Structures are given as structure tokens and as C-alpha cells.
Design a protein around this ligand. Structure first.
Ligand code: NA
Length: 240
């Protein structure tokens, strides 16, 4: 997250760190959202590689013991069947991961609340992106979980020529684009949390940014719109 601030450690308890095994160690690669005690929602493109993955819930500092972490292996990966990895702009950038164990809930570990199906945010709706991704274009991962305030940019504006044009689909949410704050590599898969009727819900799964850089004016971060996939998610969980 570029232009973020450190999150309080109990602010975003559905955020997870998706990590892969890197020699004797584990490395953060993507974010996600805990949606059942044994299921995580992330981006399809985060699980394109044939790696060994684990999820960490209750994580705040990637590089220090927080005393709140639970570490769980990934047992099954269900990627959206229309996902095509060399075509992120087509959408369907979403995957569900079934965890090997069910995690225990507490003030650091909670299920993410999803929007009702079909819900679309009014232009300029208040939202926060969270993650441990790069803090500058071509920079390094954050140590501690970051948040940035990224108001939505509606489809009509986001799909206009000076923004993303045809690349942005109505199955996506755009947020930010101020040139200062954004998602960045390592944030993919994580939540966009939007305050609606007094309650934060996870409206977006972080999908892509510009190749011109993370924080680029009129290239808002693009997320999979969770409310387009409510039936899909329920179908997968019911059938596994
Ligand atoms: Na930690």
C-alpha cells in the first residue's frame, strides 16, 4: 500500500497474509479475506504459481512475533472457472482457499462481512485498502499492516478514456487514483473495506494496478467486485 498509515492491530481482523514456502522460510505474497473459519477469499492471480501456500491470520507484523498469529496450511484451491491468467482485464480474478484447519475467532481474527449480491457503491464512497504490499512503486513490502483511504470511482468514470477505458469491467470496483495512495504489489488478493449503513463490508478483492506504477493519477487501483460473485462463493462453499 503506497501512501498508507499503520493500521491498528484490531481494526481489520478478517485480513490474512497468504505466504509461500521459500527455502527454510515463508514469504508473503498476497493478501486475502477470511470468510469462513476454514475458507479464505483471495485473487486468482495470487495462486497461479505451483507453490506451497499457507495462510496467516491474526498477523500484524510480518517480521516479528505479535503473539496473535495462527498459521494454517491451504488444503484446496478453487479458482473461478472463467479466470484466464494472461487476461486479468477480463475479470474473474477471484479464488477460494479451503484451510486445513478451522481457525479460532477472537478480536484479531474475524470473518469478513460480504455485501449483498448486486450492490454497487455510489461514486466517491469511503473505503480503505489494507495490506502488506510495497510501500513505493518498485519498493519493498511493509513490515506492519498498512491502510489507505481510497474513495471509489464509479464505472462510468473509471471506464472513461483518461482512466482505464475498456480494461475495467462492471464486475470490478475502482478506488483511489489520486496519485498519492494506492494498492501495490503484495496487496493483491486483499480486501477493499467500504463503510455502508454503518458497517464495513469487503466490497473488493485487490486485482491490479497500472504498469506505469502503483500510485498513478487516473489509474485507480482495480478490485474484483465481491458483490458480483456472491452466488459463486456460496456454491463453492456448499459443494466443498
Ligand atoms: Na507477526
Amino acid at each position: 500500500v503506497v501512501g498508507g498509515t499503520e493500521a491498528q492491530r484490531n481494526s481489520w481482523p478478517s485480513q490474512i497474509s497468504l505466504q509461500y514456502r521459500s527455502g527454510s522460510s515463508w514469504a508473503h505474497t498476497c493478501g486475502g479475506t477470511l470468510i469462513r473459519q476454514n475458507w479464505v477469499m483471495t485473487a486468482a492471480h495470487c495462486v497461479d504459481r505451483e507453490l506451497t501456500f499457507r495462510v496467516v491470520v491474526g498477523e500484524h507484523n510480518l517480521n516479528q512475533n505479535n503473539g496473535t498469529e495462527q498459521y494454517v496450511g491451504v488444503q484446496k484451491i478453487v479458482v473461478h472457472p472463467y479466470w484466464n491468467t494472461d487476461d486479468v482485464a477480463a475479470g474473474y480474478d477471484i479464488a477460494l482457499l479451503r484451510l486445513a484447519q478451522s481457525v479460532t475467532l477472537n478480536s484479531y481474527v474475524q470473518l469478513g462481512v460480504l455485501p449483498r449480491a448486486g450492490t454497487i457503491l455510489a461514486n466517491n464512497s469511503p473505503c480503505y485498502i489494507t495490506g502488506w504490499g510495497l510501500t513505493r512503486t518498485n519498493g519493498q513490502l511493509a513490515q506492519t499492516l498498512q491502510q489507505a483511504y481510497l474513495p471509489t470511482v464509479d464505472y462510468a468514470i473509471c471506464s472513461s478514456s483518461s482512466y482505464w477505458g475498456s480494461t475495467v469491467k462492471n464486475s470490478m470496483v475502482c478506488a483511489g487514483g489520486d496519485g498519492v495512495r494506492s494498492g501495490c504489489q503484495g496487496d493483491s488478493g486483499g480486501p477493499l473495506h467500504c463503510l455502508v449503513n454503518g458497517q464495513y463490508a469487503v466490497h473488493g478483492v485487490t486485482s491490479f494496478v497500472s504498469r506505469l506504477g502503483c500510485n498513478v493519477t487516473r489509474k485507480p487501483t482495480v478490485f474484483t467486485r465481491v458483490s458480483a460473485y456472491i452466488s459463486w462463493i456460496n456454491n463453492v462453499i456448499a459443494s466443498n
